[PDB]
Every structure is written in C-alpha cells, then in structure tokens.
Write an enzyme that holds these catalytic residues in place. Structure first.
Site, PDB file in Angstrom:
ATOM      1  CB  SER A 100      -0.958   0.048   1.180  1.00  0.00           C
ATOM      2  OG  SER A 100      -2.051  -0.797   0.947  1.00  0.00           O
ATOM      3  CE  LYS A 130      -3.843   0.932  -1.255  1.00  0.00           C
ATOM      4  NZ  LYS A 130      -4.436   0.249  -0.092  1.00  0.00           N
ATOM      5  CB  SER A 166      -4.246   0.811   3.890  1.00  0.00           C
ATOM      6  OG  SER A 166      -2.984   1.401   4.070  1.00  0.00           O
ATOM      7  CD  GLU A 209      -4.391  -2.617  -3.470  1.00  0.00           C
ATOM      8  OE1 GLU A 209      -4.282  -3.803  -3.067  1.00  0.00           O
ATOM      9  OE2 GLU A 209      -3.699  -1.685  -3.030  1.00  0.00           O
TER      10      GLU A 209
END
Ligand code: NA
Ligand code: NA
Length: 262
Positions: free
Chosen positions: A44, A47, A104, A140
């Site tokens: 993550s 991001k 997240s 994802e």
C-alpha cells in the site's frame, strides 16, 4: 559504537527478513541507506504516489476532487473499511484519496486507478517526475503478493525516499496539491505502531504504510521535528517470518534508531 547503517544491519540480523531503509535530512542533504538500491514490494505505500498522480491530473484540469464516483458491491476487494460503507451514495475523488491514504482502503485505490488510467498510467507519472525505478504492475489486491524475487509492484528505499521528497517537498505538484497531499499523509490512521511509535512525541509525521504477503511491513514518511527542516524516511521490510505486531516493532525500532542518530 557504530554508524546508523551498521545499527540497521544488526537490527536486520536479529529480526530476520530483509530490511531496506533510506533517510534524507533536507536541512543538510545528509543521506543514509541500508539495502537502499534493492527492490522491495511496495504494497500500500504506492497509494501516496497514486494520490499524487490524481492531484497532478487536477492540476492539469483533467480531474476534479469533488467528482463523485459511484460503484457497486462487485467492486469491493479485500480490506476496504471505508468504501464498503459507501456502495450506497458513492464517494468523491478526494474522499477516495483520503481513504486510500489514511485507512489503506484497497477498493478506493482501485477506483482511483480507474480514474487515473491504471498501473501503467501511475508508472508513467513516476517516470515523468524522474523516478525510473518504481513500478506498479497490478491492481488491488494482487499487488500485495510480495513474492520474493518478483520485480512487479516494487520500489527501492532510495527511489521511494527521493520520490516522496519530490512529491511532498518538491516541484511536482501545485502548491495547493502539495498541501492537500501533505494533509492526507498527516492524517494517516494506520501508522501508530510503526515509525510513529519510535519517534519523539513532538515530531510530526505524515506517512503511508504497506502490508503484504511473505511477511511484508512497510512505512514511508516525511517527518518534521519541532522548528526543524523535514526528514524523509523510507522503510521496507519483507521475507520476515514474524507476526504482524513483531514486524511493526521492527519499523518502530528503525524510527527510534533514526531519532537517536538525527
Ligand atoms: Na540518494
Ligand atoms: Na499479529
């Protein structure tokens, strides 16, 4: 006594796994790294970069933070604590950036990827700001697989520290977008047991964590001690056999070692 990089090596030795660290003190340009040019799975931590790429689209008049994105239960993937509450009514681009960064949220990241043009568009954004190393390959949740030896969805600690500096403290974004991005990382909710846990209480932290397969726990941050220029810290830890709380403690100890050196 020993240099900080040697202290990190000893931490790695007693912890098991593979530890990567890069630190930049922006006051002096002091740089240190441990396994700084080895690849690690981002999970993550990407991001933060995704939100930056979205903000660059906003800067170019190609996107709007108040645009509402409507989706369905079919979009929900593993670990989506915010977006799973808003199948009804949707969420704005800003809300999705905030969810992706501060919780997240994985579906938030996929929806933002869809808005941006996908992993190749994010990777192209990174090349455009001078990061020739970092790469997003998958969506994802598969991108968290963290297979050892797999170059997909990886960065290096040095590349990521440099990119985070470029984005949060550099020329890549408009002043308004840079402030917004910093705002989101300052508001992170997933990092209290990681770098934050090793730093003095009055140091201010904006960070993005990552967690994945093969014992992966990451944390990247910009850190502002009181009345002092910021320090950029990227920490990647993988191939650990330790449980999640123990891996969090490894990152917190990197934070402490950094605070005791700087
Ligand atoms: Na460097
Ligand atoms: Na655990």
């Amino acid at each position: 006594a020993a240099a900080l990089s040697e202290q990190l090596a000893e931490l790695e030795k007693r912890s098991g796994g593979r530890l990567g660290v890069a630190v930049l003190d922006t006051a002096t340009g002091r740089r240190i790294a441990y396994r700084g040019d080895e690849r690690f799975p981002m999970c993550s931590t990407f991001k933060a970069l995704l939100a930056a790429a979205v903000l660059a689209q906003v800067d170019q008049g190609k996107e709007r933070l108040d645009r509402r994105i409507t989706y369905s239960k079919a979009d929900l993937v593993d670990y989506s604590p915010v977006t799973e509450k808003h199948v009804g009514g949707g969420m704005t681009v800003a809300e999705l950036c905030e969810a992706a960064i501060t919780y997240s949220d994985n579906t938030a990241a996929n929806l933002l990827l869809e808005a941006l043009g996908g992993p190749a568009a994010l990777t192209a954004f990174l090349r455009s700001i001078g990061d020739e190393v970092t790469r997003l390959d998958r969506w994802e949740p598969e991108l968290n697989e963290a297979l050892p030896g797999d170059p997909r969805d990886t960065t290096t600690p040095r590349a990521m520290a440099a990119t985070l500096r470029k984005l949060l403290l550099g020329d890549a974004l408009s002043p308004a977008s840079r402030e917004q991005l910093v705002d989101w990382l300052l508001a992170n909710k997933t990092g209290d047991k990681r770098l934050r846990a090793g730093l003095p209480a009055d140091w201010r932290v904006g960070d993005k964590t990552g967690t994945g397969g093969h014992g992966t726990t990451n944390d990247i941050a910009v850190i502002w001690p009181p009345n002092r220029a910021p320090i950029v810290v990227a920490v990647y830890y993988t191939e650990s056999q330790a449980d999640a709380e123990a891996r969090d403690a490894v990152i917190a100890e990197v934070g402490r070692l950094v605070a005791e050196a700087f």
